[PDB]
Nucleic acid binder design. Structure first.
Ligand code: NA
Ligand code: NA
Ligand SMILES: [Zn+2]
Length: 327
DNA sequence: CATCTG
DNA sequence: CAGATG
């Protein structure tokens, strides 16, 4: 956690780059289990040969660890941090809609900057365009003070459209957090579930509402169950407009909301633990359901849930207010 | 995983 | 349809 930190981090830069710049998914994958195990390891790696002793710990990586242990740095790492072609891809990639693949293509087309981007707005698709257009706002964190205002609206509109709608803002926002990076709404309706053959209007009617009153600004992607968008809290009394925020809305069959809601609320660490305990208690949990474990090895059959409560109960645990769902 | 592009 | 992004 700090005894093998540098090692783990270097491996991290390394792994990362393999994947992003080079295409080296193997290599890339290599660095990763390696950092992973070194990460676990209870001692102070004092040499490469010592490391080597580990699994995922090959010869090359050991070598690397040596030079790093030997001297406060790594040549290769130094060589990669410089290289404009590398840095380019790390940067282009910051654009919502641009991934590595794309970051590569452009650079080899010579697009390497924001400007470049604008100049070539013809070459980007819709998401990418939006991504570019709001590059700044998009990197800005979201203060819970705004979150509540947001949340405030979404909920009232969902309401007006149908009293029966069920909306929930999950996320860290949900677990307490002072700021969040995006608004994530879990949505369901009685009239929608596991068997119930579809109902797209279910998701599309609210989307519409939100754009109605202009809360929703743009559409990143709009499917029948998940919508990727952009929103914004009406600029008050003109002088202070708000940043454009990323936002997601997703329809859930009523018969699987809470596992969802639970799941989406995190934290990753809380899940796992919760997950592991369910397992003890003779169960299984995932994003959609909780099932009683047969002994034959495994086994299914969806336990029935009406709240986050029903879940804990199942695994017979202390209900946790979201705030304390940290770890 | 669900959506988009081409 | 494969392949990309979030
Ligand atoms: Na991006
Ligand atoms: Na292939
Ligand atoms: Zn020791």
């Amino acid at each position: 956690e700090t005894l093998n930190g540098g090692i783990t981090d270097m491996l991290t830069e390394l792994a990362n780059f393999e994947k992003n710049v080079s295409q080296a998914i193997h290599k890339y994958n290599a660095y990763r289990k390696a950092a992973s195990v070194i990460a676990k390891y209870p001692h102070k790696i004092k040499s490469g040969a010592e490391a080597k002793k580990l699994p995922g710990v090959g010869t090359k990586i050991a070598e690397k660890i040596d030079e790093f242990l030997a001297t406060g740095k790594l040549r290769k790492l130094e060589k990669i941090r410089q290289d404009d072609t590398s840095s380019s891809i790390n940067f282009l990639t910051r654009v919502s809609g641009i991934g590595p693949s794309a970051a590569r293509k452009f650079v080899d087309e010579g697009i390497k900057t924001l400007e470049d981007l604008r100049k070539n707005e013809d070459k980007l698709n819709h998401h990418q365009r939006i991504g570019l257009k709001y590059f700044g706002d998009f990197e800005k964190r979201i203060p819970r003070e705004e979150m509540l205002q947001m949340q405030d609206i979404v909920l009232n509109e969902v309401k007006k459209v149908d009293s029966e709608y069920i909306a929930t803002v999950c996320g860290s926002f949900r677990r307490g957090a002072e700021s969040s990076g995006d608004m994530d709404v879990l949505l369901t309706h009685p009239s929608f579930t596991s068997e119930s053959t579809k109902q797209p209007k279910l998701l599309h009617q609210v989307v519409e509402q939100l754009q109605k009153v202009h809360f929703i600004t743009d559409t990143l992607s709009k499917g029948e169950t998940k919508f990727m968008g952009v929103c914004q809290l009406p600029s008050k009394n003109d002088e202070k407009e708000y940043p454009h925020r990323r936002i997601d809305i997703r329809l859930i069959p009523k018969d699987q909301y809470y596992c969802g809601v639970l799941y989406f609320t995190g934290s990753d660490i809380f899940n796992k633990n919760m997950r592991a305990h369910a397992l003890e208690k003779g169960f299984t949990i995932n994003e959609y359901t909780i099932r009683p474990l047969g002994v034959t090895g495994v086994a299914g059959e969806p336990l029935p849930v009406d709240s986050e409560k029903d879940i804990f109960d199942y695994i017979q645990w202390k209900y946790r207010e979201p705030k304390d769902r940290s770890e």
